Amino acid sequence: MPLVYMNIIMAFAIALAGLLMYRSHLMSSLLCLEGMMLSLFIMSTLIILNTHFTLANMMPIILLVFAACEAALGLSLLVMVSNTYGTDYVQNLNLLQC
Amino acid sequence: MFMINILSLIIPILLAVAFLTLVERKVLGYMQLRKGPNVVGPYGLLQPIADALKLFTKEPLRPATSSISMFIIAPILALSLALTMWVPLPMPYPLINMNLGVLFMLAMSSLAVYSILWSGWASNSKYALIGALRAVAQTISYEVTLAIILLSVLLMNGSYTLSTLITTQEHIWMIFTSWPLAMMWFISTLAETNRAPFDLTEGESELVSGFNVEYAAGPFAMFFMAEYANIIMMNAFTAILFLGASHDPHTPELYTINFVLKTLALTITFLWIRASYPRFRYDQLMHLLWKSFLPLTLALCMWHISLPIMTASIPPQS
């Protein structure tokens, strides 16, 4: 395949890795989720433009819509976590175990 | 020869900003029963040169607690974007001819806000942070309404190409078809350029100097240049969008003169507005945009979608 496609898939892998390996802040993980969506948008757009699937030009917009909903959902939960602990740290949410 | 055109566009714009400072000082002076600058040069003509030279020979200071990299990046971004926002404007021909010129304008404007946010944060000062959060609030307040107003007005045009707006208005100004949207758009451009009564971010009475209080000398002058350039750019865009000037292909200088006169009138109207009113509280601005402008804007978007279909008046160039 083309060099450009490889780079976008690498971006997805890096953002996925970033999401998986947490640090202290939740907001950083939320950002990683957004990054994954951004790379998915770019990849699907490149594939759609290249093959000239005309009707599929609308699916990246739908992708963005749902990405926004997910982002909004993530920020709500962060507001509630911060209100509980005064901090958005992952370590605070250890009340429930396996 | 294209770099000649780039410089031809940029050098004049900076000179016009320099002298807009003088015109504002004199207009506010005369509305306040005084004169404004009349000593440095005949009729204060040399005052902008003295101000610029005074600012670029004064010591620039980097705050001890500040993040230096973003502190320095923010004014560069501000001024470079202020200059960039001019390239698709058809006067009557654009330097860059875009298919989606309006949408490019929206994206670049939306990116312009980060310079104010970054500068305030980089400063690591309380008043700078308060100014930056006021900027966040201001964008949240006017961003949705401003975009939908452009969409509604643009439906009659048929595309997002800025040069098509000249053809759309060959016989009548588009303000005779959308003066309500024109009113709300004018107020949204006042809010979008951080201008009285909507200039919350500077907060001179409230926060002393807001986001740029820390800034001194040349970096400060860059923020100032960027803001005044944005004031002229928004008005020029408003003129092209609502008061299209007749264009003659064989004599474009006539269009240029008409367009420049209309944008000067709109800029002087900004200065007048600043001289006339009290400042809006920042929470109130949000209420104004979300409880009054947004319902009317939604209804008028519905109306402007339905109207060309009802009347068989839909425009060309899918």
Partner: protein
């Protein structure tokens, strides 16, 4: 290619202005001068402390209303279709639910800032 040259020129001009501003004038920097400004006095706490956001709910709602704009921008092109009754029905439907979501958050006191 012309837009890339334009962006490069603008960024270069701004960077050269910053360079001149920092290398032309005399520099006399000392700790008192470079300290944080708080109107005559030393700040009590840090400016990096959490700063409460009272409009936090309108900020989340802005994220959803900003994507309504991405769904409404193709409307100048959608008007050129042959089945205008379906296009108009769909466009009207989209703006009606945008007005209903605004009416919902408004009536549930979601536009009032936290106290």
């Amino acid at each position: 290619m012309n837009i890339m040259l334009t962006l490069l020129t603008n960024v270069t001009l701004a960077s050269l202005l910053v360079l001149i501003a920092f290398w032309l004038p005399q520099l006399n920097a000392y700790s008192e001068k470079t300290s944080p400004y708080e109107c005559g006095f030393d700040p009590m706490g840090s400016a990096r402390l959490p700063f409460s956001m009272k409009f936090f709910l309108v900020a989340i709602t802005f994220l959803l209303f900003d994507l309504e704009i991405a769904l409404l921008l193709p409307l100048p092109w959608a008007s050129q279709t042959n089945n205008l009754k379906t296009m108009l029905t769909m466009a009207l439907f989209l703006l009606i639910l945008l007005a209903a979501s605004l009416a919902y958050e408004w009536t549930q006191k979601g536009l009032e800032w936290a106290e």
